């Protein structure tokens, strides 16, 4: 397929239809309409690897939403990318002030 011939796996045609419906431009760039899908695929691979690592850390086979929470929050670059958006049933990294301790 087009993704297979490109080495991709995300459905490019669905995104093409979405962009055509969104009418962000009359004639969208058809030289590489799956490129915007390729960058999203790279970001998704990053976040999925981090989530899988976080889930593996606490001996849980399945991706806990909290596991994804610390996976995204730990990375400073990820926090800069997406920091104004919260995640349902997420959490907060344990941050206790050293001078607060007795």
């Amino acid at each position: 397929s087009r993704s297979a011939k490109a080495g991709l796996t995300f459905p490019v045609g669905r995104v093409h239809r979405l962009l055509r419906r969104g009418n962000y431009a009359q004639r969208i760039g058809s030289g590489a309409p799956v490129y915007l899908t390729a960058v999203l695929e790279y970001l998704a691979a990053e976040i999925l690897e981090l989530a899988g690592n976080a889930a593996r850390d606490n001996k849980k086979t399945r991706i806990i939403p909290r596991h994804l929470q610390l996976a995204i929050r730990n990375d400073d670059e990820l926090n800069k990318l997406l920091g104004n958006v919260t995640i349902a049933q997420g959490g907060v990294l344990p941050n206790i002030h050293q001078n607060l301790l007795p």
């Binding site: 919260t86 349902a88 049933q89």
Partner: protein, 49 residues
Amino acid sequence: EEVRAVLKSFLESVIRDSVTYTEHAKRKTVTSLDVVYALKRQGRTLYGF
């Protein structure tokens, strides 16, 4: 008292924006997806719904 004031200043504003949005959607009901628009325009988006 101050936290209660924060709720009384935060919840109602997004409530008004949500109800005027779902009225703009011509839907005589409120769904969870309508809250997401308000959260996005308020600068604090929520994932999962």
